[PDB]
Amino acid sequence: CSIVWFRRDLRVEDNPALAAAVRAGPVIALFVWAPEEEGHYHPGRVSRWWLKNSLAQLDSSLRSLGTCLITKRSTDSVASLLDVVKSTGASQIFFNHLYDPLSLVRDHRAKDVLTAQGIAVRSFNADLLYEPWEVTDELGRPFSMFAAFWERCLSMPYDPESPLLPPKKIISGDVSKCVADPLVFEDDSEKGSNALLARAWSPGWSNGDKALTTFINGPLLEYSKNRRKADSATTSFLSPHLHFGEVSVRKVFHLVRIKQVAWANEGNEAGEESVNLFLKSIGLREYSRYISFNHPYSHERPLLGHLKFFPWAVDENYFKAWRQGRTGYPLVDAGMRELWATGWLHDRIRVVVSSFFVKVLQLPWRWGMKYFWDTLLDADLESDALGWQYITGTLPDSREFDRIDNPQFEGYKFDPNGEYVRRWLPELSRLPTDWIHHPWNAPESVLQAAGIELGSNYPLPIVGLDEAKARLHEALSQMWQLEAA
Ligand SMILES: Cc1cc2nc3c(=O)[nH]c(=O)nc-3n(C[C@H](O)[C@H](O)[C@H](O)COP(=O)(O)OP(=O)(O)OC[C@H]3O[C@@H](n4cnc5c(N)ncnc54)[C@H](O)[C@@H]3O)c2cc1C
Numbered sequence: 001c002s003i004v005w006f007r008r009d010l011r012v013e014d015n016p017a018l019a020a021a022v023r024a025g026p027v028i029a030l031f032v033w034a035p036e037e038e039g040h041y042h043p044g045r046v047s048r049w050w051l052k053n054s055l056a057q058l059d060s061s062l063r064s065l066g067t068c069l070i071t072k073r074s075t076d077s078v079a080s081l082l083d084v085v086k087s088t089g090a091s092q093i094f095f096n097h098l099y100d101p102l103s104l105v106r107d108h109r110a111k112d113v114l115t116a117q118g119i120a121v122r123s124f125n126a127d128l129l130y131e132p133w134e135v136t137d138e139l140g141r142p143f144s145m146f147a148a149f150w151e152r153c154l155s156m157p158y159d160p161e162s163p164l165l166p167p168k169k170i171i172s173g174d175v176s177k178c179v180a181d182p183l184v185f186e187d188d189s190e191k192g193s194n195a196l197l198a199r200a201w202s203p204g205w206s207n208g209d210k211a212l213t214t215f216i217n218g219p220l221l222e223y224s225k226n227r228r229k230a231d232s233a234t235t236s237f238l239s240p241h242l243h244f245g246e247v248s249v250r251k252v253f254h255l256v257r258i259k260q261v262a263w264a265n266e267g268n269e270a271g272e273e274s275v276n277l278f279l280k281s282i283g284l285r286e287y288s289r290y291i292s293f294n295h296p297y298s299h300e301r302p303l304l305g306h307l308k309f310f311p312w313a314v315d316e317n318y319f320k321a322w323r324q325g326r327t328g329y330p331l332v333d334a335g336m337r338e339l340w341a342t343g344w345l346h347d348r349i350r351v352v353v354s355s356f357f358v359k360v361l362q363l364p365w366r367w368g369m370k371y372f373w374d375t376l377l378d379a380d381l382e383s384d385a386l387g388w389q390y391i392t393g394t395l396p397d398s399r400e401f402d403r404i405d406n407p408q409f410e411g412y413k414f415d416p417n418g419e420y421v422r423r424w425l426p427e428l429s430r431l432p433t434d435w436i437h438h439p440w441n442a443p444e445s446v447l448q449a450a451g452i453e454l455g456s457n458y459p460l461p462i463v464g465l466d467e468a469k470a471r472l473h474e475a476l477s478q479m480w481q482l483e484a485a
């Protein structure tokens with residue numbers, strides 16, 4: 001008896017722990033659901049809906065290969081392990097690493113208790129191209145900025161392990177344990193709100209493979225010339241799959257690396273450029289793990305402390321307006337609406353709405369981080385923290401802090417004909433393009449004809465940009481003054 005402990009590596013292909021267990025003797029595939037152990041960050045409704053369907057496909061797969069997935073509901077995953085080994089008679093437990101703060105601790109506490117109880121525990125790399133410790137500068141120190149880190153990752157002395165085949169068969173230790181703990185990922189209220197998700201997404205590794213294929217053989221070619229596109233099938237849509245290890249980044253990297261070689265050869269410039277930007281995307285995810293491991297309180301504590309005494313507005317209705325998409329800036333409200341209704345946001349809108357959150361409303365970034373974590377289909381602690389820290393300006397490589405983006409111009413850049421704003425704001429569905437990104441200026445006759453009553457079915461800017469720059473300054477004058485102490 002060997003135990004395979006699945007957490008966020010829901011796949012049978014290129015899964016090192018599983019492959020090591022099959023090499024060793026029969027297996028008991030285990031998954032333990034223990035949210036309260038996740039603190040302030042238990043999984044949100046749409047993430048849970050994804051987990052529920054991803055696990056079903058995982059179990060279905062494992063059954064095809066010979067064993068079932070045993071699920072356990074508990075308040076302490078370690079304890080559950082013990083009660084599983086101490087009931088099955090297993091001597092080893094194989095699992096794949098995780099690099100988020102909450103996982104880092106529980107994993108150590110896990111190794112200690114189990115090994116110090118007579119259990120062999122082995123741990124592999126299932127989620128990264130390279131372990132964060134394998135990637136370092138010539139002196140041997142962790143890089144402090146993305147570019148230097150990514151340049152090393154791409155110029156390493158050795159290649160990432162190549163995707164392993166899933167087992168061809170698995171033998172299962174005590175099959176009488178197959179009927180285990182039912183996991184409930186939805187209350188009746190939520191079942192209601194989740195009803196459209198199955199129409200747009202197919203959770204699981206099988207479908208993730210499908211998405212990777214689709215992407216590489218289609219949109220990747222125009223990945224680069226298509227990113228100012230706000231709501232189009234121009235990206236991979238792999239994030240939710242990536243978050244639960246349903247798809248191997250190593251496989252992703254290998255397929256992308258083959259296309260790049262073929263396109264370099266052909267001298268297809270668009271292709272190379274798109275390949276480069278997409279690899280930078282995979283790079284950023286790898287970097288979020290790097291930062292979380294080399295700064296264990298990164299999901300709450302900022303890296304740079306130069307904004308330490310900054311007087312962040314703690315205004316509750318500023319927050320509510322943001323969440324409701326009642327800020328007055330069309331592109332910002334469209335994003336909040338699409339996020340609330342679908343749990344999905346293109347990276348540019350994520351930047352647009354989180355940026356408005358810290359520079360215009362000037363709210364604490366931990367609040368935007370948490371809201372995103374509860375509502376995004378790909379909620380990921382490391383990727384969410386990294387994004388918020390970068391936007392707020394607490395990262396070595398963030399853009400200049402004293403800079404406020406104009407949603408009206410972002411509107412012109414990312415949603416030139418107002419199609420995005422009109423899809424997510426039906427109240428503005430009749431407003432012509434000349435005023436779609438700044439309706440508060442518009443002549444009364446256009447508003448009346450479109451059915452828009454400023455302040456009613458569409459609000460006036462909750463904070464003007466000019467007034468915004470001014471509070472930003474007044475806020476800096478203050479933090480500088482607080483520094484003097
Ligand atoms: C403030 C903010 C919060 C974010 N929160 C999350 C989150 O909670 N979960 C999440 O996975 N991503 C998050 N991101 C990053 C990014 O927007 C999403 O990963 C991406 O939009 C998912 O779409 P895709 O799968 O089509 O990405 P693609 O463009 O197809 O890229 C492929 C993969 O690269 C990775 N990736 C791409 N961009 C980034 C990025 N900027 N940072 C980290 N990884 C990236 C993702 O795994 C993505 O699936 C956030 C970005 C910002 C600015």
Ligand SMILES: Nc1ncnc2c1ncn2[C@@H]1O[C@H](COP(=O)(O)OP(=O)(O)NP(=O)(O)O)[C@@H](O)[C@H]1O
Pocket residue numbers: 146147227284347351386387390397398
């Ligand atoms: N250093 C970084 N750390 C974390 N995230 C980053 C970093 N740099 C960029 N990002 C993320 O990747 C996105 C794109 O990077 P950026 O440097 O803005 O190029 P870009 O978006 O292609 N610019 P543009 O060509 O005008 O569209 C950012 O908006 C963030 O989502």
Ligand SMILES: CC[N+](C)(C)CCCS(=O)(=O)[O-]
Pocket residue numbers: 200201202203207208210211232233237238
């Ligand atoms: C536009 C991308 N959509 C279709 C919404 C998601 C891709 C489907 S999935 O779940 O198989 O990746």
Ligand SMILES: [Cl-]
Pocket residue numbers: 306401402
């Ligand atoms: Cl500053």
Ligand SMILES: [Mg+2]
Pocket residue numbers: 202207208210211
């Ligand atoms: Mg698919």
Ligand SMILES: [Mg+2]
Pocket residue numbers: 223226227228229230234235
């Ligand atoms: Mg795009």
Ligand SMILES: [Mg+2]
Pocket residue numbers: 226229230231232233234235346
């Ligand atoms: Mg698009």
Ligand SMILES: [Mg+2]
Pocket residue numbers: none
């Ligand atoms: Mg940019």
